[PDB]
A paper describes a structure:
Type 4 pili (T4P)—important in bacterial pathogens—are filaments composed of one well-characterized major pilin, and several minor pilins whose roles are often poorly understood. Streptococcus sanguinis T4P are composed of five pilins, which makes it a good model to determine the role of each pilin subunit in detail. PilE1/PilE2 are the major pilins forming the backbone of the filament, while the three minor pilins (PilA, PilB, and PilC) form a tip-located complex promoting adhesion to various host receptors. Here, we characterize PilA and PilC, showing how they interact and how they function.
To confirm the prediction that PilC might be a modular pilin, we solved its 3D structure by X-ray crystallography. After optimizing the best diffracting crystals and using SeMet protein for phase determination, we solved a high-resolution structure at 1.45 Å. Strikingly, while bioinformatics only predicted that the C terminus of PilC corresponds to a lectin domain, our structure reveals two distinct modules. The first module adopts an Ig-like fold (PilCIg), consisting of two β-sheets packed against each other. The second module that corresponds to the lectin (PilClectin), is a β-sandwich characterized by two opposing antiparallel β-sheets of six strands, with concave and convex sides. PilClectin shows significant structural similarity to multiple carbohydrate-binding proteins, including galectins such as human Gal-7 (PDB 2 GAL). In the Gal-7 structure, the protein interacts with galactose via a carbohydrate-recognition domain (CRD) forming a patch on the concave side of the protein. Since the two proteins share good structural homology in that region, we speculate that the CRD might be on the concave side of PilClectin. When we compared our two PilC structures, we found that they are essentially identical, superposing onto each other with an rmsd of only 0.79 Å. We then purified these mutant proteins and quantified their affinity for 3′-SL using ITC, before comparing it with WT PilC. This revealed that PilCT347A and PilCK349A displayed significantly reduced affinity for 3′-SL, which was particularly pronounced for PilCK349A, with 39.3 ± 1.4% of the WT binding.
Author numbering: 2 to 35, 46 to 61, 64 to 75, 80 to 270, 275 to 324, 327 to 373
Amino acid sequence: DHHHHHHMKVTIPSGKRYYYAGMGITTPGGKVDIIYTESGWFLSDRAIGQSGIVPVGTIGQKISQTLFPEMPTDFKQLSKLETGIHITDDMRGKYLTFAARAINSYGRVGNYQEADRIWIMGLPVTQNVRLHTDADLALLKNGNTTSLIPTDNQLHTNTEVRDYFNDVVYGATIPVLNYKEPAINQTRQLIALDGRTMQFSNHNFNNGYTTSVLIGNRQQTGPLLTYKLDDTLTWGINLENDGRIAIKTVDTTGGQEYIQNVKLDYSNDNSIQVRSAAKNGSLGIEIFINGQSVYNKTVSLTRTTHNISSGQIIFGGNTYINEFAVYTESLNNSNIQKLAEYFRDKYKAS
Ligand SMILES: [Ca+2]
Ligand code: NA
Ligand code: NA
Ligand code: NA
């Protein structure tokens, strides 16, 4: 007396490990290769059950304490068909999966076998994205093999971090940590530059730009975000330990002032968004902290004329960055608020 195991290949040919909403994406269809099968598409809840816990993104596969949704109890059936799924806004921050199960001669239903899972990015505004990095998707890299970052609250420099919008691997050394956050009873990741920088070149600051950043709930200091407008003119945001924010303009051919009435509470996460565009030969800059617009000033380009057509965006400091996006648009108020709401609720279960 013995038992045979029979095989199924369950895939999404050409499918990716993540997609954005708001971009007109429809996934490729699923495929099952084999007595009978039942297949379909499933979408996770926003609370992973036993007070459910919030799901967090990955493009890797299960050292790590991250909790991932379990099939089938943490999922709802989206389709009984195999054809591809049109991504909708309601799917953001959830896992989408194609799965199939075998049924035997006696009607007995096996366990679901999944294709590679799809994380639907939380980012609610995709128009004009130039760079997008979610620290939760960073992986550990040893040689050419990647794996999940261990939940040890240590800065690892053997990492792989991308601009996920264009699917480009960053070459800079980017330390990342993974830790269990008690406020959410779930892990998350933070880019921890520790004084290093991430330097992005060829940015035309005459045109509309928005840089949106979510920083973590730890004390931080240093030059979180700097715009190197040209070879001699620089504008930057500097964090202090007390939570005050210093804005500095340096013209090596400026000034320094604190944002008025602003004290970041590092007990919480905080979002900082900067929108800018040139007008009348000066660069106008507006800063939103947690969705409120605290600072709205202009930087003179003539006081000798500064050509800001090929500047740099530089992240730095002793900071903890959970997510950032750079847009080649000065986003309107509605979109600034959509981003602020997303950043506030990224780790809220529901
Ligand atoms: Ca089987
Ligand atoms: Na994401
Ligand atoms: Na590691
Ligand atoms: Na729910």
